[PDB]
Design an enzyme around this catalytic site. Structure first.
Site, PDB file in Angstrom:
ATOM      1  N   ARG A   1      -3.450   2.198 -11.384  1.00  0.00           N
ATOM      2  CA  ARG A   1      -3.395   3.638 -11.513  1.00  0.00           C
ATOM      3  C   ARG A   1      -3.212   4.079 -12.953  1.00  0.00           C
ATOM      4  O   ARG A   1      -3.230   5.287 -13.212  1.00  0.00           O
ATOM      5  CB  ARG A   1      -2.250   4.184 -10.658  1.00  0.00           C
TER       6      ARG A   1
ATOM      7  N   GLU B   1       0.829  -1.201   0.000  1.00  0.00           N
ATOM      8  CA  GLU B   1       0.000   0.000   0.000  1.00  0.00           C
ATOM      9  C   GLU B   1       0.870   1.260   0.000  1.00  0.00           C
ATOM     10  O   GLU B   1       0.903   2.030   0.959  1.00  0.00           O
ATOM     11  CB  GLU B   1      -0.998  -0.041   1.158  1.00  0.00           C
ATOM     12  N   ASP B   2       1.630   1.397  -1.091  1.00  0.00           N
ATOM     13  CA  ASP B   2       2.556   2.499  -1.360  1.00  0.00           C
ATOM     14  C   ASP B   2       3.646   2.610  -0.296  1.00  0.00           C
ATOM     15  O   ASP B   2       3.728   3.582   0.443  1.00  0.00           O
ATOM     16  CB  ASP B   2       1.809   3.826  -1.513  1.00  0.00           C
ATOM     17  N   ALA B   3       4.472   1.582  -0.217  1.00  0.00           N
ATOM     18  CA  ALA B   3       5.807   1.707   0.337  1.00  0.00           C
ATOM     19  C   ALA B   3       6.810   1.296  -0.730  1.00  0.00           C
ATOM     20  O   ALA B   3       6.449   1.067  -1.882  1.00  0.00           O
ATOM     21  CB  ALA B   3       5.960   0.887   1.613  1.00  0.00           C
TER      22      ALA B   3
END
Ligand SMILES: [Mg+2]
Ligand SMILES: [Zn+2]
Ligand SMILES: [Zn+2]
Lengths: 51, 65, 293, 94, 257, 56, 44, 101
Positions: free
Chosen positions: C189, C4-6
């Site tokens: 995305r 989750e966006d690291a």
DNA sequence: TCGGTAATCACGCT
């Protein structure tokens, strides 16, 4: 004047009385780890020695 | 900002093979054969010769004592 | 760890030079003149004077009140020792203050969370008659956890952890990746320009010439994947990779390229603060606002 | 390298091993597997930032031999197997 | 167990090891990175720095210079590393470029491996003076103490039957990159001593006509250094650590009982 | 006669405050325990003296 | 007294009570020069 | 525990604050711990649950054809907490080699 | 119908 000190969206019902600034807190960023349990939390040792 | 003396992934020296590299690209020779002629094998060594700024000249003359 | 966006940067790659960035501030202490005729001079404060900040914070000053450069100022260490002029000599008379007659200490000191070393001390005079000194102190700031990175396509994130070079999933050549990006963020995305640039880094590093990539007239898509296909690699980036913990080929072909990232100044050492019991408001006796106060 | 036992039972042994890492732990694990009397050999590193030097080992036997005895003779082999390869290596660069 | 030395060059080597297994190869690989010690500059004392670069940056480059580590004079298989320190001083004045070769060493066995590295450019009247202290360390604590790299791969054989259209294209292709090909009237066998990118036309034939079979127990090793240790000493030193490391276990085990 | 979740968190709260202000403890000893953790062990064995009032 | 070094090189050791100028250059701006003591920076 | 906070990890900011007095601290432990909040009052369904890798990892474990060998079964039961004795048994499909399902 | 006036408009941080 008085009516703007009592009021005005940052007066002295919401600004200072029913929402106050507190003690014994901290604020930093978050970063994952899936090795601790569901109901634990990491705490840095710099924040841990000032609370 | 003079060339980094290692790469950033593959530990290998590079700063001896940059000023010999650029003086043979200002004659018109293609860099695809110049970097092959030296000891550069992968492309992790090679992305950090081919893209650099050599900005130490401008800042140096400005001076601070 | 990279969920989750690291993102998971290498350890030995931080430790050789990636994104080592410096940080500066400056301070602008002066020497004013009041209209009474008394001008406050700055020097080394004596033990007596009212309103003392503390002691043994004055170990770096010279005689006149200026730090000689290259000194590790940290915490609440002072920078310039300022003496102020009396300020109501006859109001208090607090049983010894009639004879003392001294001064009320005001000064400048670094903001109480930083560190670093001074770089250059300025000293001059500004327009009227006064004097003002400028002092600037720098910092080194290695990239540890928290430090927000981002691409130029919009893939922002934070360092997840900092895994050593030995435990890295590596490839059937001398390649050991740096940023193991989460695969759950690319087909969600719609950032296909990330994946075209990743081939364009591998093509334009092996060929020799930096691939043009401007809008509408740049290098086309299909002509890149043939220039990679005749230089020795599979047409779509995918390569055979061996895991570093146990060591066996992962039964997939892990994608890998060269993407230009950039570090951002939402670094973590400017965010963390803790407060047990500090100075309060004068009007309400409630805590103050901001980390600088 | 001090062995910190935790659980001790019948035909079972669990312990922590200070000073070691993935490198040695994985090598000793699959080497142990070769022994038919070893029913269950494994290890884990727990949260590699707060601790990454004490893998937790677990050795379970079928009762015909103790867990310590199995471990003991199986780390002999690695010493002997390295002793082989080394001799080969030296006498080959000629 | 046997070896086949393909090539020996300055700071590189490739060879084939037989008679081993999958767990052992990683233990050998990781040990070269995290156990072998070398010397590296650990702290630098500054007297003055008028250059265009910061104090920290000049100190950072000194740490990244590979230093010769003579293995016949200390101990590389010890559990307790030697603390012997060598002092590297410098006193120069511009103008001119300062090279790594100008650093003087108090002990002739510890010197920079590559003398053509530029450290910093100096303008008129700028002085640069420092003292560098070097000590032994391991790669696991800091990346500066790494002796080089190791990479390994399986050894496989690609069988290409002559029923595949345009199989002749693979024989010339394989010969360009140096992979050995043994040809017969039934088929050809390509030994993949390095990566073999299959060209796109043959993808539909991967598995039906063209198939890959792994050769059990054989690995192709590649070891390259930077000049701090010979390309032959490395593998011997790492093996002697594994022996010592997995012998302490027996000593410690008996103590428990 | 089961307690709710609001009464169980008040009986512990009043008993953990008495156990800090004197009020000799039952069989609760071992080796070191913060005054909150002493009230948790006493509630499990059902030897709480404090009872609720149920207005009805 | 001090020993301040200005822009465009020069030395000017004066005091601090009256005026801050450089006689040779004619400017008025000063950097304080670095000392010649020994400090200790680690390489990380 | 990151659908209750509705957070992500692109440099956000979370603040803790310690409670102090012994009545307000034993109230925090009984009434506010995480495991009491596994379901939510808006719809009954669970809220603290699995996310991105926890779903798509679980498909690769239960596919028909997910046969793990002996070393990989034994390694993963040590890593996922559980404590079982010598019963990974009984090697259900020995058709190629003795490996589990 | 019909005109007139106030009184209102995230969270945190620099
Ligand atoms: Mg956010
Ligand atoms: Zn590289
Ligand atoms: Zn001048």
């Amino acid at each position: 004047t008085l009516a703007q000190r009592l009021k005005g969206k940052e007066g002295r019902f919401r600004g200072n009385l029913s929402g106050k600034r507190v003690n014994f807190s901290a604020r930093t960023v978050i970063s994952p780890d899936p090795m601790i349990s569901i109901n634990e939390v990491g705490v840095p040792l710099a924040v841990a020695m000032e609370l | 900002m003079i060339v980094p003396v290692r790469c950033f992934t593959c530990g290998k020296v590079l700063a001896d093979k940059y000023y010999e590299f650029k003086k043979r690209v200002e004659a018109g020779e293609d860099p695809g054969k110049v970097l092959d002629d030296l000891g550069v094998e992968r492309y992790c060594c090679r992305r950090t010769l081919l893209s650099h700024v050599e900005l130490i000249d401008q800042v140096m003359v400005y001076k601070v004592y | 760890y990279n969920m989750e966006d690291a993102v998971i940067i290498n350890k030995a790659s931080i430790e050789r030079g990636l994104a080592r960035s410096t940080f500066f501030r400056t301070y602008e202490a002066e020497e004013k003149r009041y209209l009474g005729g008394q001008k406050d001079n700055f020097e080394v404060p004596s033990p007596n004077i009212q309103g003392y900040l503390g002691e043994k914070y004055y170990r770096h000053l010279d005689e006149d009140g200026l730090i000689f450069p290259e000194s590790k100022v940290e915490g609440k260490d002072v920078l310039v020792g300022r003496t102020s002029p009396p300020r109501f000599i006859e109001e208090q008379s607090s049983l010894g203050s009639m004879v003392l007659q001294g001064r009320r200490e005001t000064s400048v000191t670094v903001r109480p969370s930083e560190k670093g070393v001074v770089d250059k001390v300025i000293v001059t005079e500004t327009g009227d008659g006064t004097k003002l000194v400028k002092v600037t102190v720098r910092d080194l700031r290695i990239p540890e956890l928290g430090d927000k990175f981002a691409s130029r396509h919009g893939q922002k994130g934070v360092i997840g952890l900092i895994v050593p070079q030995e435990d890295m999933p590596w490839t059937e050549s001398g390649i050991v990746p740096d940023l193991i990006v989460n695969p759950h963020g690319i087909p969600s995305r719609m950032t296909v320009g990330q994946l075209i640039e990743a081939i364009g880094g591998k093509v334009a590093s092996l060929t020799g010439r930096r691939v043009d990539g401007t809008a509408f007239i740049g290098e086309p898509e299909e002509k890149l994947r043939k220039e990679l296909e005749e230089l020795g690699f599979k047409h779509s980036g995918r390569e055979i990779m061996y895991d570093g913990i146990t060591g066996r080929r992962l039964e997939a072909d892990i994608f890998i390229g060269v993407i230009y990232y950039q570090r951002l100044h939402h670094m973590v050492a400017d965010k963390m603060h803790a407060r047990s019991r500090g100075p309060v408001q004068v009007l309400t006796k409630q805590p103050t606002e901001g980390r600088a106060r | 390298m001090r062995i910190e036992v935790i659980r001790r039972e019948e035909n079972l042994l669990e312990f922590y091993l200070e000073g070691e890492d993935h490198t040695f732990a994985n090598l000793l694990t699959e080497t142990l597997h070769e022994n038919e009397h070893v029913t269950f050999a494994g290890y884990t590193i727990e949260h590699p930032i707060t601790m990454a030097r004490k893998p937790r080992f677990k050795v379970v036997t079928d009762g015909k031999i103790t867990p310590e005895k199995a471990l003991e003779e199986a780390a002999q082999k690695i010493f002997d197997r390295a002793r082989e390869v080394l001799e080969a290596w030296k006498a080959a660069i000629e | 167990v046997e070896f086949k030395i393909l090539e020996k060059r300055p700071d590189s080597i490739k060879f084939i090891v037989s008679g081993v297994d999958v767990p052992f190869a990683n233990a050998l690989r990781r040990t070269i990175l995290s156990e072998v010690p070398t010397f590296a500059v650990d702290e630098v004392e500054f007297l003055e720095n008028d250059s265009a670069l910061f104090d920290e940056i000049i100190a950072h480059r000194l740490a990244m210079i590979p230093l010769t580590t003579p293995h016949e004079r200390f101990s590389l298989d010890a559990l307790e590393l030697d603390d012997y320190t060598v002092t590297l001083s410098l006193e120069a004045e511009g103008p001119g470029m300062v090279y790594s070769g100008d650093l003087k060493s108090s002990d002739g066995d510890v010197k920079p491996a590559n003398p053509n590295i530029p450290i910093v450019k100096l303008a008129e009247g700028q002085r640069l003076t420092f003292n560098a202290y070097a000590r032994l360390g391991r790669g696991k604590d800091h990346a500066k103490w790494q002796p080089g790299f190791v990479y390994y791969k399986y050894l496989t054989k690609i069988h290409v039957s002559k029923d595949v259209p345009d199989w002749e294209e693979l024989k010339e292709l394989a010969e360009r990159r140096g992979l050995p090909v043994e040809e017969s009237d039934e088929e050809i066998v390509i030994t993949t001593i390095k990566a073999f990118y299959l060209p796109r036309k043959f993808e539909e034939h991967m598995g039906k006509g063209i198939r890959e079979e792994i050769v059990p127990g054989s690995f192709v090793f590649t070891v390259e250094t930077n000049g701090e240790l010979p390309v032959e000493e490395i593998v011997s030193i790492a093996l002697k650590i594994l022996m010592r490391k997995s012998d302490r276990f027996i000593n410690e085990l008996h103590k428990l009982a | 006669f089961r307690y709710t979740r609001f009464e169980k968190a008040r009986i512990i709260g009043a008993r953990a405050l008495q156990i800090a202000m004197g009020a000799p403890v039952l069989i609760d000893v071992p080796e070191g325990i913060t005054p909150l953790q002493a009230a948790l062990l006493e509630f499990e064995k059902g030897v709480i003296p404090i009872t609720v009032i149920r207005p009805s | 007294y001090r020993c301040a070094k200005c822009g465009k090189e020069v030395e000017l050791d004066l005091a601090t009570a009256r005026e801050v100028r450089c006689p040779y250059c004619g400017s008025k701006i000063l950097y304080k020069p670095r000392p010649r003591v020994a400090r200790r920076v680690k390489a990380i | 525990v990151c659908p209750p906070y509705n957070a992500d990890f692109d440099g956000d900011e979370m603040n803790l604050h310690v409670p102090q007095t012994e009545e307000a601290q034993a109230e925090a432990k009984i009434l506010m711990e995480v495991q009491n909040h596994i379901i939510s009052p808006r719809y009954g369904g669970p809220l603290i649950a699995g996310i991105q890798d926890h779903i798509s990892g679980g498909y690769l474990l239960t596919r028909e054809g997910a046969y793990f060998t002996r070393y990989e079964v034994e390694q993963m039961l040590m890593f996922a907490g559980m404590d079982v004795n010598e019963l990974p048994e009984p090697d259900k499909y020995e058709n190629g080699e003795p490996l589990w399902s």
